[PDB]
């Protein structure tokens, strides 16, 4: 199917700028 | 019918068994979530808890009225080390003893397919003590069946004494598919 | 298929084993594809494969087709026990390479077979690999959650590396961890006679290894005690206890024996070393006030060398203090603590009790004394 | 096959319920932050910027001078001095 | 940095460098090249006499030097090479140029300035005139 | 050996004492018991599942005259030198008693009444040694 790659694909690079997003997130809260 | 359930999960190296296509873990993975699913639809205020049956048992989820965060903690589950059977209900009769909701029935379906090695007077003992505290241990075999099938009609046996329903024995040597065999079964069958 | 075709053929044409081929072929059929993992070891270990290239066939076809989803460290081991019996060293590594980057999820498996192809390598020499090898498997090996065979078998390798460079301190020290990890009792009886006596050796020339307690209590020796070689077992007791009076009766034998003959000079010494060490551990702190003449009567050295012998002493680090030589005597205070006996910590109890009876009286004497002031 | 139809069901069932999970809980984080964030702030510089992460130096328009050991919210933009 | 409540000192910072840095005529580095005097070289193979003091120190040992002289005054009509002659024989050297305006407050300034400098190397204080 | 530790009450609560406070971390657990029990190495894996070094702290409520009232373990599993066999279990960790200034002040206002002297009394100094 034409999702499987396109599905990972888009998975890794919503996780990654995700947990980036929480990094910072409570590296604020800590701030 | 408000429901506390504790799925027990063993996660033994028999679980290499590729009977069931694609292989067994898979097939418990998808019987899991279908009964957790169909458990959770039926009155949604039931709460679904989590166990996993290895070296040394341990509880994965407790009691909750969700379905995703279970699935996704059993989807990393791998197989490893041996099964302890009575801790694994010892913690779930814990388990049931704190959930949050005192007012549900209290019920335990164990995916139990491996050779249970365990004593069977310390067997029935501890059957007939959760029949004492009310509880309901519904057993899904899929394995060792000339080995463990007279141990689980005695855990049923005993736990109904007479007329009760409340536990259930379900066994399936034949591997078409777990899921469907999960689903065309008594257990589910009332919810 | 072509493997359940071997499966059928070998069911009779197999080595031995009249109906297992049925079990293991059903079980195959059934696709279990683990159930058979223990019946592969329990039937690959019997005496029936020396040989054979029919072990080798046999792993090539159903293995192949098999080794998808099964135990990577199963599979590792059944490796092993094919590659045991092939004799083409040079294709043996390519061979196990492979089977590493076959097993790559299993990182205790690819502990395992980075092992085996640094004892290959050893095997065939390659002195400078093997020890790289042992470096790289030893640091990612220590990165895992417990102990476990894996740990039992790079000790191993490590122990034989050691032994064959001739490093007997480390040897001593690995082969030591091997015993702990493995179980003594599954070893047969000749292994453990074989590595306890190595153990011996290594520990008798070892540079730094004082500490040959903790062997005559480790069940591993429990191999010597009525064999024809508890001589082994004494010498090491008499260094223990360092009796160098007792060392010379033993020399009866340790002649016999090339390398420990060659390295007489370095076993006189090195009994001195933990004779001058026991002695001060038994003497009081009151009178630790060592003479000449006393280690002359201890292990045989004319009053010219002792002096040189605490100096060595002191420099090793095995005792600690000061050699006044114009009274002829040495101040020792200090000892490297070693593992001891059960009468050697009877003695300690009995000075225990001795000083909790001072400790108490004297606690009575100032309490009482000090009644009507103390807050 | 099967295991297209394993992987565009149970793998997505699992991983579109995490970032659900993820997705909710950062509302929760960024509202919180958003009710910190109150907005009488008081107008300063940044005189000084310097790292050991990045600090502050900051010069409060109260005529006063402040180190901050943590920057806070703003995005580390290089902060010029 | 000290605590905001209990005032104690928490942690110790690098200095401050406020405008009065630069100002201050406080710019350790900075050369250029040799070649673009283009005449001047008797001038400043002359000012390449006081290229001996750090090279060596002979001074010591059978002579002294009283802490051997600190340059020549490079005396100049209205302006020639001053700066720049300067400049290249440095760079020659490998040394830093610390140069200095001298055009009781100005006095502790430049007093300070290079009691700051000499800890750290021509320097190159000039501008006597007014 | 069986037990049932809430992980998902200690994830909520360490979830929001980090929204009160955020210097705090979860660095291990305590248990009320006098001795240790087969149990105590099987929460000691489940808790390292919050912190790699999580440490064992026993502090035993009845209170003792000689020593604190507080045992630290650090599970370590490592092969014996010793050359026995190995099994994971505990390891004393150095424990003591500290206090913030905000707790002193509590903890001083509390003894208040049944505080010593901060001074070294002759008959005090007596008792100590006692
Ligand atoms: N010999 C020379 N060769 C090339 N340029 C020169 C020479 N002498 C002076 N200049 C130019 O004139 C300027 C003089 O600068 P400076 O020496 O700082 O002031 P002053 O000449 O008044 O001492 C320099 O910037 C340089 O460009």
Known sequence: ?31 | ?191 | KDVPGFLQQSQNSGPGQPAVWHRLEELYTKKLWHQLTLQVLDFVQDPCFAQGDGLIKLYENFISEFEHRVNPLSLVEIILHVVRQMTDPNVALTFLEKTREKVKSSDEAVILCKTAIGALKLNIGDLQVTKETIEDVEEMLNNLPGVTSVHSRFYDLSSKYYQTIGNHASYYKDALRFLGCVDIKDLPVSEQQERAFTLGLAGLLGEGVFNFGELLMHPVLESLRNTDRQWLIDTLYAFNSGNVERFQTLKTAWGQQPDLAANEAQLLRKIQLLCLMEMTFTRPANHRQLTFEEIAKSAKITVNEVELLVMKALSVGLVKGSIDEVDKRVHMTWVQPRVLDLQQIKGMKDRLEFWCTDVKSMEMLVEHQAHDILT | ?81 | ?130 | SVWFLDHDYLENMYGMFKKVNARERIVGWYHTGPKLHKNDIAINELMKRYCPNSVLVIIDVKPKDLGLPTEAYISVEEVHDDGTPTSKTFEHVTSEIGAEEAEEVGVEHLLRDIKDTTVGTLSQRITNQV
């Open chain 2, 1 to 191: 019918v408000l429901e506390s359930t504790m799925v027990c999960v063993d996660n033994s190296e028999y679980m290499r068994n590729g009977d069931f296509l694609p292989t067994r873990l898979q097939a418990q993975q998808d019987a899991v979530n279908i009964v957790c699913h169909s458990k959770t639809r039926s009155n949604p205020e039931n709460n679904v808890g989590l166990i996993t049956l290895a070296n040394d048992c341990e509880v994965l989820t407790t009691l909750t009225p969700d379905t995703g965060r279970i699935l996704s903690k059993l989807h990393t589950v791998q197989p490893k080390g041996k099964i302890t059977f009575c801790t694994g209900i010892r913690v779930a009769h814990l388990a049931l003893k704190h959930r949050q909701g005192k007012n549900h029935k209290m019920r335990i379906i164990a995916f139990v397919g491996s050779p249970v090695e365990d004593n069977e007077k310390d067997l029935v003992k501890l059957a007939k003590r959760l029949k004492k505290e009310k509880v309901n241990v519904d057993i899904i075999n899929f394995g060792e069946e000339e080995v463990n099938t007279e141990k689980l009609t005695a855990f049923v046996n005993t736990l109904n004494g007479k007329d009760g329903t409340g536990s259930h024995l379900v066994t399936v040597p034949p591997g078409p598919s777990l899921a469907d065999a999960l689903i065309s079964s008594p257990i589910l069958a009332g919810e």
């Open chain 4, 1 to 81: 096959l099967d295991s297209e139809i394993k992987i565009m069901k149970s793998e997505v069932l699992r991983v579109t319920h995490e970032l659900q999970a993820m997705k909710d809980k950062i509302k929760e984080n960024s509202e919180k932050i958003k009710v910190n964030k109150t907005l009488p702030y008081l107008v300063s510089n940044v005189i000084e910027l310097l790292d050991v992460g990045k600090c502050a130096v900051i010069k409060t328009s109260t005529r006063q001078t402040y180190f901050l050991p943590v920057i806070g919210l703003v995005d580390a933009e290089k902060l010029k001095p």
């Open chain 5, 1 to 130: 940095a000290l605590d905001m409540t209990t005032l104690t000192i928490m942690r110790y910072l690098p200095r401050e460098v406020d405008p009065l840095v630069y100002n201050m005529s406080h710019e350790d580095p900075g050369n250029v090249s040799y070649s673009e005097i283009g005449g001047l070289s008797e001038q400043i193979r002359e000012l390449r006499e006081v290229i001996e003091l750090p090279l060596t120190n002979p001074e010591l040992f059978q002579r002294v030097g009283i802490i051997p002289p600190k340059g020549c005054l490079l005396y100049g009509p209205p302006g020639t090479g001053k700066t720049l002659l300067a400049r290249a024989v440095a760079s020659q050297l490998d040394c830093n140029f610390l140069k200095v305006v001298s055009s009781g407050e100005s006095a502790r300034l430049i007093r300070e300035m290079f009691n700051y400098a000499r800890d750290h190397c021509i320097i190159f204080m000039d501008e006597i005139d007014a």
């Open chain 1, 1 to 31: 199917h034409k999702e499987i790659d396109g599905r990972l694909k888009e998975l890794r690079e919503q996780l990654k700028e995700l947990t980036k997003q929480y990094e910072k997130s409570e590296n604020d809260l800590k701030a």
